[PDB]
Write a protein that binds this ligand. Structure first.
Ligand SMILES: Nc1ncnc2c1ncn2[C@H]1C[C@H](O)[C@@H](COP(=O)(O)OP(=O)(O)OP(=O)(O)O)O1
Length: 319
């Protein structure tokens, strides 16, 4: 017996029997290119291993309210529109702020929005839109808001089953295949407090599952500026999972580009961080992540070069 060789034949038949990524090495480096939709976050893009959200797949983005999950979904939509794609938004929360969405670069006017009367209707409409192959991405707001018609139409405490999770199951079962044929990325948003009853099946049907969470409150000096989010890619059937990313989302703003640059530039050594002060190729950036953010904001030439440097090192800029 020659373990490594017996192992390859094993993993080969596993992937062949159940698909690419059925089993992989955490430390491997996937060259499977696969057509993604940039998450609007460079670090998150890298964490996913393929530059963004894989297309034709089910993506789940769960986490507590106000942790950044809609922002990622919106940024995702925007990048898909910019690349000439058509976007759909199955809304059952009635929270969306098109004004904020435009700010993140979304073309709201061309955005399809549906506000379904029940969970069945919601999924059914999404399934119908998907099968026209016209969409590049479709976002479903609130897995939890997908309450069965039976529950909606007031019905007795009798015959009360875990119908919502069944609903989400059958729905995901038939939709996933279409999503594959269509190549449409379907982001399910799980604002959670079973993962909201329906997140049960979503756990098995997703090719990617992002754990969005808010960790810090960007204070800059000593006042509210934005908030730092951390996303853990808990499931990734297209790359080695378990990676992590972090990013700033200033108030009323989307994911900070400069913020990302300052973070990855530091860790990747392109930008030196002496305690308190930041420097790049011997240029002074400022004393304070925020001053540095401002600096990079104003000196668009720097940052663009830093982005280049950081980009080059790890694949390249998104689409
Ligand atoms: N309408 C808005 N006005 C100002 N800032 C906003 C707005 N929407 C989002 N943001 C910014 C600041 C928020 O602290 C940050 C995170 O909120 P959001 O992305 O909605 O979190 P979330 O997606 O985890 O919540 P949920 O998914 O429950 O809606 O995004």
């Amino acid at each position: 017996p020659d373990r490594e060789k017996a192992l390859e034949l094993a993993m080969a038949q596993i992937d062949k029997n159940f698909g690419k990524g059925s089993v992989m090495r955490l430390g491997e480096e996937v060259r499977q290119p696969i057509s993604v939709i940039p998450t609007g976050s460079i670090s998150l893009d890298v964490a996913l291993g393929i530059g963004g959200l894989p297309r034709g797949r089910v993506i789940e983005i769960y986490g507590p309210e106000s942790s950044g999950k809609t922002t990622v979904a919106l940024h995702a939509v925007a990048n898909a529109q910019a690349a000439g794609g058509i976007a759909a938004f199955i809304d059952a929360e009635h929270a969306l702020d098109p004004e904020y969405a435009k700010k993140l670069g979304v073309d709201t006017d061309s955005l399809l929005v549906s506000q379904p009367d029940t969970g069945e209707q919601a999924l059914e409409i999404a399934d119908m839109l998907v099968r026209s192959g016209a969409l590049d991405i479709i976002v479903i707001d609130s897995v939890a808001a997908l309450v069965p018609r039976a529950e909606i139409e007031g019905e007795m405490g009798d015959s009360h089953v875990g119908l919502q999770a069944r609903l989400m199951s059958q729905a995901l079962r038939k939709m996933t295949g279409a999503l594959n044929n269509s190549g449409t990325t379907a982001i399910f948003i799980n604002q959670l407090r079973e993962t909201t009853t329906g997140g049960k099946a979503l756990k098995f049907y997703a090719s990617v599952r992002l754990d969005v969470r808010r960790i810090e409150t960007l204070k800059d000096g000593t006042d509210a500026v934005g908030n730092r989010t951390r996303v853990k890619v808990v499931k990734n059937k297209v790359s080695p999972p378990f990676k992590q990313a972090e990013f700033d989302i200033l108030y009323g703003q989307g994911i900070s580009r400069e913020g990302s640059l300052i973070d990855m530039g530091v860790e990747h050594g392109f930008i030196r961080k002496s305690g308190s002060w930041f420097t790049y190729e011997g240029e002074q950036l400022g004393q304070g992540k925020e001053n540095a953010r401002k600096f990079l904001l104003e000196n668009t030439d720097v940052a663009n070069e830093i982005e280049k440097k950081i980009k080059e090192k790890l694949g390249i800029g998104a689409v």
